[model samples]
Target chain A: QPVNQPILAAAQSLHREATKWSSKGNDIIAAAKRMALLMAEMSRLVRGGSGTKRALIQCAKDIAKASDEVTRLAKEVAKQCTDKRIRTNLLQVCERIPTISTQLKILSTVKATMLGRTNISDEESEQATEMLVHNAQNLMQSVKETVREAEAASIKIRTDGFTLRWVRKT
Target chain B: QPVNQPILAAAQSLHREATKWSSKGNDIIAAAKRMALLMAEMSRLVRGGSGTKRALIQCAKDIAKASDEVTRLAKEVAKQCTDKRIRTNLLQVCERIPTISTQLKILSTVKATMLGRTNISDEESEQATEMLVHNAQNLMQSVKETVREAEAASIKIRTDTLRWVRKT
Candidate 1:
């Protein structure tokens, strides 16, 4: 597995909620938005190979703060909302935030160990090679998914031009 | 746009064909596999920033060479296939290869210019920030898509355990 896999997984989960709430036009301190941005910045630093332990740690802490605010905000929304689905969704987003913080923090100290290790072979290159293959599989998924979503969205966009079926007088 | 945007777009297009042929169990010099692997390697190196102009250029040429081989193989397949859709898909894949080469080459000499330049008030950080938002949007799409695909595939898998529609 690539060193970035867990981090990527965590980011992807957080992304689901961010998209959900933003679409719902729900925000607080844009905390959900900021948590996501901070996660993004942290991910850029890690995957870009530009951050030191200090930088990664600083990012981890920043995410923790944002997570706290988002969690608080989500709780307020969750507590106040009568709709179970939206409340459940927001609460699930709250559950997902700390995992990102923990993943980064571990990488900053301990997970960083798995990197920079002794190798009997060109294991570093092997990681790169494996990363390539895995990432390629992932890119396939994304390209297909993107084009599909775009295709699906395109129908909605075009059909809405002349008339509407999504929402109408019944 | 992030500096990596065109690069990613090119990679994604190439990926569509790689998946196409690899699934068909097609290989000639294992060209598609290697092309995809090289493209993958090049992407990792670039995004990792472990690459220099010399390194990127070398990788670019490596990809170009891989592209030619993959092109020859795809052309051969395209020329021989009875199934026009399969032929067309591969021909389309062939069309996508060099864009990766061109994108990487420009980045090596010119697009590299967009990087390593003057900045006002952490514009570098701004790129990172924008990258986050854009990447976040992308990941959301991926998460939904992956889960949807998996869910859709799950039915295929289980139903096929007892019966088959995929190929009956």
Candidate 2:
């Protein structure tokens, strides 16, 4: 039950935090996305941890569904976001969507390979799969960083001069 | 390079398999959904793994996008999917789409939490997030099963009298 407690505590905290940020228009989308992240993390721990239970699986799935709804809401909010600074930042985050989508696809490929449904004949082949999985995870982290960067930039733009230049150096 | 080979190979193999199944009118949607399962699994592994490079991250993102596209395609195919059995099967898979989307959202949330962006200050916080990830992965598996079931059912329907009884 101690492990279960963690899941409950996490859910409670996330819900409370989400409620707080949900009231702030600029932070609503990000807040929704944040809630999704918390939900995914908690669900994963329960299912993969010592507390793996049938009920937990159902709970995880339910939370995941809620998280998706939140993500969609965030996306919608971003679309309707009025502040030019936040808009630009949100757009940058939007750009990462494709990258996120791609990473997920790579992740899918690795999973299919691991399930042994397909013919993977060599260790090298398996290594290749692992490597892809590794890279995808890393990229996702990087994408998250970029997302944060965009968010940070938006914060600055909203408060400061909105004159920060974001570009790759040649 | 050497590491990227497996993923690309997996992708190629999946796409090739997709092409073969695509020959059948209704099976393609199921195939694509199945492909989405692959994407979801890959996302779990890669995101959870340690090797985070810019290129690697981009590859992961591409696959995620591919999976999303596949899901969308499957939904579209569900509409055009001729066989009632096929439609039912694909629809079952479709049901999991919401699960996948939710998991991704949760994944995003977890990422935010780890980065200190959100004040998710609770003892059980991590557990909750992990559960969501696990659920998404499980649903992905369920989605895969639904596709396989539909595929098998499609074969039976075409060859047996089961189709006549269920045919609309």
Candidate 3:
């Protein structure tokens, strides 16, 4: 839809975007924790799979690093806004963060497990892992977008006397 | 991302394309009931606003009509698959159906309410209403996609012996 509408757009955007984060640290920590959990689940599913243990370890390490970054960023941005409504909305976002994370984790885990020991050839395993990696990347990308949006919104709320008005105006 | 990847693609597709209905009318009925409640809330929100009563009534009637169709279709489609896992997934979709419906209903209601009030300048109302309608349409469009995907998946599950195999 065209983005020029006012209150309705604001409200709908509010519904979709408002909860993208929580109090600074919690938001990223929460997201990172979830990604870690997802990776753990992924690790569990691929327990007996053919991937090199070194590769899996590196993958796990990458996930851990990303989680740390997300936690760090989430907190820094959360500090930008003090508006009660914004904070409340952030709380809502934080609460539901786990749900989305959980859903993705389950999907990733199931998909991994399905290919783990299947009669599929090693070539197939490689292909499957590649797909999983892509899907995981997509999830991370979406999470990054959420973080960026929350940061921008937080900054907006803190500056310009307009406050929530920008949410509606722009 | 390549479509050629079988298991991963199938798993991803399953994540994206599962569920929509159930037998025993209760499941669909329950969803329909929730949608009706949401519409009622919409009606209430726009109750005293300046908008024409005729239009509100028409909107309410339209919602009711759509709700009935959804309920009927949900039941019919739900019976296609007998697999418990697929059925369970379908139920999950059905359960979430109301949440989307509720969100759309509230958005629509708020827009109508804003427009109905004359004290608010007509220009502002129109601007707000336009935005609201866009949001409403977007939500409905998403709903339609979900229903479409769910129906397709349900049929596939029923016809194919693989059950949730396509999911993983």
In candidate 3, stretches whose alpha carbon ends up further than 4 angstroms from where it belongs are A1-170, B1-53, B79-89, B102-106, B121-131, B153-168
Q: Which residue pairs of candidate 1 clash?
A: none
Kindly list the per-residue Cα lDDT of model 1 for residues B30-149, writing each as its tens digit: 444454455445444444432343565566567656656655554554555555665565566555544434333433332232334454224323433233333323322232232223
B87-152 per-residue lDDT for model 3 (tens digits): 556555544444333333333433554544566445444434443344344334333443554555
Expressed as tens digits, the lDDT of each residue in A52-170 for candidate 3 is 34344444445544555454454445556666666555444433333333333332333344444555344334434443454354445445454555555555654652212212212
lDDT of 2 by residue, A1-170 (tens): 23334334434444443333223333433434454454445434332423333333343344334334433433553555557766566555545444333333333333333333344334424343343334334333433443344445444444321112222222
How many clashes in each candidate?
Answer: 0, 54, 5
**Which runs in model 1 stand beyond 4 Å of their true positions?**
A1-29, A47-51, A111-170, B1-168
Interface RMSD of 2: 12.4
Task: List, residue by residue over A1-170, the lDDT tens digit for candidate 1.
Answer: 12455445545544554443222223332444455555555544455332344565576667666655545544554555555665565566555544443333432432232234463124323333233333323322232232223223334333221111111112
Candidate 3 achieves a global lDDT of 0.43
lDDT tens per residue, model 2, B1-168: 122233334434444444344333444444454554454444444344244323333433443454555456556546655678777877777566544543443343333333322453342334334434454455445544544555555464455511211211
Instruction: Give the C-alpha miss distance for residue A11 in model 3, angstroms.
Output: 20
lDDT of 2 at A77: 39
